[PDB]
Amino acid sequence: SITKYSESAGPIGQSIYTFTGVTVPAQYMPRLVATTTVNKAGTNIEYKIAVNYPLVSVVDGANVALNTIRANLSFTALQSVINTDEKLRVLDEIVSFITANKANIIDGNVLTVT
Amino acid sequence: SITKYSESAGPIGQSIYTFTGVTVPAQYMPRLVATTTVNKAGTNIEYKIAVNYPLVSVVDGANVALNTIRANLSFTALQSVINTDEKLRVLDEIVSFITANKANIIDGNVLTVT
Amino acid sequence: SITKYSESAGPIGQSIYTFTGVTVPAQYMPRLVATTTVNKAGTNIEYKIAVNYPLVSVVDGANVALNTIRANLSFTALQSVINTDEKLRVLDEIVSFITANKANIIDGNVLTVT
Amino acid sequence: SITKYSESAGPIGQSIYTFTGVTVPAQYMPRLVATTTVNKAGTNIEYKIAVNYPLVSVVDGANVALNTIRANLSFTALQSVINTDEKLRVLDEIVSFITANKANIIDGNVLTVT
Amino acid sequence: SITKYSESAGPIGQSIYTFTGVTVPAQYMPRLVATTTVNKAGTNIEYKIAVNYPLVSVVDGANVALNTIRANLSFTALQSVINTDEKLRVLDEIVSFITANKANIIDGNVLTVT
Amino acid sequence: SITKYSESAGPIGQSIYTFTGVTVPAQYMPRLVATTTVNKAGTNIEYKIAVNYPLVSVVDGANVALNTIRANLSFTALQSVINTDEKLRVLDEIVSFITANKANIIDGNVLTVT
Numbered sequence: 109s110i111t112k113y114s115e116s117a118g119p120i121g122q123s124i125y126t127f128t129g130v131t132v133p134a135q136y137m138p139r140l141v142a143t144t145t146v147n148k149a150g151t152n153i154e155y156k157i158a159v160n161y162p163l164v165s166v167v168d169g170a171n172v173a174l175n176t177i178r179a180n181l182s183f184t185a186l187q188s189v190i191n192t193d194e195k196l197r198v199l200d201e202i203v204s205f206i207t208a209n210k211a212n213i214i215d216g217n218v219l220t221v222t
Numbered sequence: 223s224i225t226k227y228s229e230s231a232g233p234i235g236q237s238i239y240t241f242t243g244v245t246v247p248a249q250y251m252p253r254l255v256a257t258t259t260v261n262k263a264g265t266n267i268e269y270k271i272a273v274n275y276p277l278v279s280v281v282d283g284a285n286v287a288l289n290t291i292r293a294n295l296s297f298t299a300l301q302s303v304i305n306t307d308e309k310l311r312v313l314d315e316i317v318s319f320i321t322a323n324k325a326n327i328i329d330g331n332v333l334t335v336t
Numbered sequence: 337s338i339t340k341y342s343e344s345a346g347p348i349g350q351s352i353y354t355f356t357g358v359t360v361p362a363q364y365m366p367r368l369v370a371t372t373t374v375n376k377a378g379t380n381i382e383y384k385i386a387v388n389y390p391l392v393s394v395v396d397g398a399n400v401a402l403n404t405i406r407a408n409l410s411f412t413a414l415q416s417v418i419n420t421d422e423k424l425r426v427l428d429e430i431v432s433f434i435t436a437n438k439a440n441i442i443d444g445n446v447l448t449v450t
Numbered sequence: 451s452i453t454k455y456s457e458s459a460g461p462i463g464q465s466i467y468t469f470t471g472v473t474v475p476a477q478y479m480p481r482l483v484a485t486t487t488v489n490k491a492g493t494n495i496e497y498k499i500a501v502n503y504p505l506v507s508v509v510d511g512a513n514v515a516l517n518t519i520r521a522n523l524s525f526t527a528l529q530s531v532i533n534t535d536e537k538l539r540v541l542d543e544i545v546s547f548i549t550a551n552k553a554n555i556i557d558g559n560v561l562t563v564t
Numbered sequence: 565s566i567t568k569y570s571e572s573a574g575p576i577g578q579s580i581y582t583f584t585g586v587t588v589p590a591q592y593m594p595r596l597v598a599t600t601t602v603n604k605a606g607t608n609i610e611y612k613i614a615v616n617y618p619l620v621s622v623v624d625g626a627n628v629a630l631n632t633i634r635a636n637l638s639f640t641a642l643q644s645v646i647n648t649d650e651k652l653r654v655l656d657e658i659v660s661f662i663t664a665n666k667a668n669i670i671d672g673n674v675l676t677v678t
Numbered sequence: 679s680i681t682k683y684s685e686s687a688g689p690i691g692q693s694i695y696t697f698t699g700v701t702v703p704a705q706y707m708p709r710l711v712a713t714t715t716v717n718k719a720g721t722n723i724e725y726k727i728a729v730n731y732p733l734v735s736v737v738d739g740a741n742v743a744l745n746t747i748r749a750n751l752s753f754t755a756l757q758s759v760i761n762t763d764e765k766l767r768v769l770d771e772i773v774s775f776i777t778a779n780k781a782n783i784i785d786g787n788v789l790t791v792t
Contacts, residue, residue: 110315119331127315140315142323144332151289153330157319161312163305165397174398175265175302177312181295181320185330188289191277195328198273198293199320201224201241201254205271206295206317214309216267216299216362217233218258220226228575228789232342232352235573248785249606249643264363283737285644301363303398338543346568347559348580355543368543370551372560374570378591381558385547389540391533403493403530407540409523409548413558415591416627417517419505422480423556426501426521427548429452429469429482433499434523434545437484442537444495444527445461446486448454507625516626558590566771568790575787583771596771598779600788609786613775617768619761631759633768637751637776641786645745647733651784654708654731654747657680657697659776661710661727662751662769670765672723672755673689674714676682 110140120144120153127161136162136173144185151188157181224254234258234267241275250276250287258299265302271295338368348372348381355389364390364401372413379416385409452482462486462495469503478504478515486527493530499523566596576600576609583617592618592629600641607644613637680710690714690723697731706732706743714755721758727751 110125127138138161145154158180162173181202185195206213212221224239241252252275259268275291297313320327326335338353355366366389373382386408390401409430413423434441440449452467469480480503487496503519525541548555554563566581583594594617601610617633641651662669668677680695697708708731715724731747755765776783782791 110319115334116332119326119329119333121332123332123334127311129311138312140319142319142332144330146330155327155330155332157316159312159316161308163303163308163397167396172396174396175300177298177300177305177309179295179297179312179316181293181316183293183327184291185328186289186291187330189277191291192328194275194277195291196324197241198252198275198291199324199327202271202273202293202295203317203321203324205224205254205256206313210310210313212233213269213297213313214299214306215233216258216269216301218230218235218237218256218269219233220229220237227785228787231345231349231571231573234342238575245646247644247646300361302361304361338547343562344560345571345573346580347554347557347561348570349560351560351562353547355539357539366540368547370547370560372558374558383555383558383560385544387540387544389536391531391536403528405526405528405533405537405540407523407525407544409521409544411521411555412519413556414517414519415558415593416589417505418589419517419519420556422503422505423519424552425469425480426503426519427552427555430499430501430521430523431545431548433452433467433482433484434541438538438541440461441497441525441541442527442534443461444486444497444529446458446463446465446484446497447461448457448465509625566775571790572788575789577788579788579790581775583767585767594768596775598775598788600786602786611783611786611788613772615768615772617764619759619764631756633754633756633761633765635751635753635768635772637749637772639749639783640747641784642745642747643786645733647747648784650731650733651747652780653697653699654729654749655776655780655783657710658727658729658749658751659773661680661695661712662773665712666766666769668689669725669753669769670755670762672714672716672725672757674686674691674693674712674725675689676685676693 113139116144120146132162132164133171136164136171138162147187152184152186155181155183155185227253230258234260246278247285250278250285252276252291261301266298266300269297269299341367344372348374360390360392361399364392364399366390375415380412380414383409383411383413455481458486462488474506475513478506478513480504480519489529494526494528497525497527569595576602588620589627592620592627594618603643608640608642611639611641683709690716702734703741706734706741708732717757722754722756725753725755 109128113126114124116123122143125140141158143156161177163175164171209221223242225242227240228238230237236257239254255272257270273293276287277289279288337356341354342352344351350371353368369386371384389405391403392399451470453470455468456466458465464485467482483500485498501521504515505517507516565584569580569582571579578599581596597614599612615635618629619631621630679698683694683696685693692713695710711728713726729749732743733745735744
């Protein structure tokens with residue numbers, strides 16, 4: 109559930125999406141930002157997913173972000189080879205691990221939940 | 223589909239898993255490593271998920287990893303607030319985005335696949 | 337009444353327990369930490385018990401530890417000799433003294449309560 | 451089982467007790483010493499419980515203390531807040547932990563005895 | 565029959581174990597120490613097993629170790645090739661040889677016992 | 679399962695044994711070499727067990743050993759004191775540890791397998 113805010117013109121660029129539920133001034137609006145950056149050598153492209161979620165509170169009549177929840181992901185989409193099966197294996201294993209151990213990732217616990 | 227190789231002693235530590243299907247020597251074994259690290263100030267703990275997938279090839283009759291697929295993912299499990307709903311929102315939104323746009327993430331493509 | 341959080345792998349290590357009654361974000365969760373450290377010479381091991389109890393209050397929408405109640409204990413478990421009767425004498429006399437003069441220890445009063 | 455040797459004049463001071471069963475010269479007499487000391491800022495007073503148990507042995511026909519069992523225990527009786535329930539919680543939890551795991555504390559063993 | 569003394573939280577570290585049957589002061593307690601060390605090139609890990617068994621004796625009312633039984637073992641767990649049947653064969657053959665010829669190994673006798 | 683290759687006629691010498699199962703040219707045949715060497719003072723004899731397992735490979739129609747699995751073991755058979763139960767205890771404990779944790783010894787992993 110994210111609403112589009114900035115779409116990249118092409119596949120190499122930056123897209124910015126806002127969280128749907130929150131109704132808070134735009135500086136402290138929680139956002140998800142995807143960013144493809146091409147290596148200087150052109151060997152690979154790096155895909156970067158950056159989620160910020162400010163925990164607002166009101167002081168002296170204005171919103172302030174006491175703390176902020178952040179989550180970042182970086183994937184090296186190699187352009188030197190096409191290994192789509194293996195590249196997908198990587199993303200799939202990350203997603204499977206998160207969804208399986210979500211309850212412990214939230215509490216900062218590396219142990220497997222079983 | 224990952225096989226456990228080393229589990230952490232406590233909730234703050236490092237756990238190492240190997241990829242199941244891959245049968246290669248351990249030097250080129252693709253792995254997923256989770257690591258919780260405590261901030262110096264103790265304000266949050268950080269969860270790190272690091273996957274290395276070395277692409278084994280043979281040059282001059284020798285095993286060499288010409289390229290390597292790497293993927294990192296960090297989450298700030300804040301310890302200064304318990305906002306489990308918000309942290310879940312963050313982690314779920316990033317997982318959902320990765321699953322939805324996976325086919326383009328692997329190619330270095332920031333556009334949404336729709 | 338303490339709930340286990342980190343258990344040491346072996347007898348030389350560190351265990352961390354959390355207080356049961358309190359429901360407060362994990363940074364300001366009151367904890368008891370036991371730690372065995374081996375002397376460089378290997379003459380004795382030191383057992384260290386460290387209790388922190390932060391007195392939380394909410395300001396500007398976030399918890400802060402105005403003050404903190406701390407209590408520390410250190411015992412020299414000599415490894416050069418086995419004098420179990422005497423070592424136990426030491427711990428027992430400390431415990432007996434605390435339980436007897438608890439009311440005055442709390443108020444910072446060295447006088448015997450009688 | 452301790453015999454009083456010196457009581458403090460006021461609530462802030464030093465009291466000295468000797469171990470009852472031990473009948474040795476005063477130079478090697480095991481003792482328990484309580485000492486309240488006021489913080490410079492006056493924010494808290496600190497309660498210190500120090501036990502020395504010298505292990506008397508005989509070398510070349512002379513009394514020498516080859517080793518000594520020492521144990522220290524400090525408590526921050528905060529003067530900036532009266533949180534008697536919380537201070538009691540701290541002191542009780544540490545005493546209960548020592549009593550429960552005493553058999554392993556004496557051996558330099560951090561594992562819980564269960 | 566050995567119990568834990570110190571177990572590294574990482575798969576590459578140093579674990580220490582103490583012998584069970586011996587009842588002496590723990591400084592002179594017989595021990596077994598396993599240690600994995602990684603090659604600078606990352607070609608192999610070396611596994612090291614070191615057993616020390618101090619022969620405690622009493623002189624002039626003091627505990628000293630006139631002699632000490634030591635046994636060292638090293639293994640090259642190659643990471644560049646997985647030949648697992650062959651690594652297991654090496655360990656199995658060395659274990660079988662020690663068990664079979666133990667009676668003469670303790671005597672400094674290289675001859676086969678049959 | 680090893681057959682003899684060279685057995686010293688003296689109780690203090692060097693015996694060589696070859697592995698049974700392997701079918702390769704005998705220069706690259708895997709071997710176990712036991713060696714007793716006497717101390718200059720005659721205080722102890724050192725028993726040495728050296729296993730080499732060459733990994734034979736074929737390059738350009740030639741037999742070469744790209745890598746080699748080695749395992750070394752040493753034991754101090756003290757001649758100045760007969761503590762035979764204790765020497766046997768050392769050998770038994772090291773053998774028991776290898777047999778139990780073999781699965782992780784071959785992987786360069788110091789952690790206990792349970």
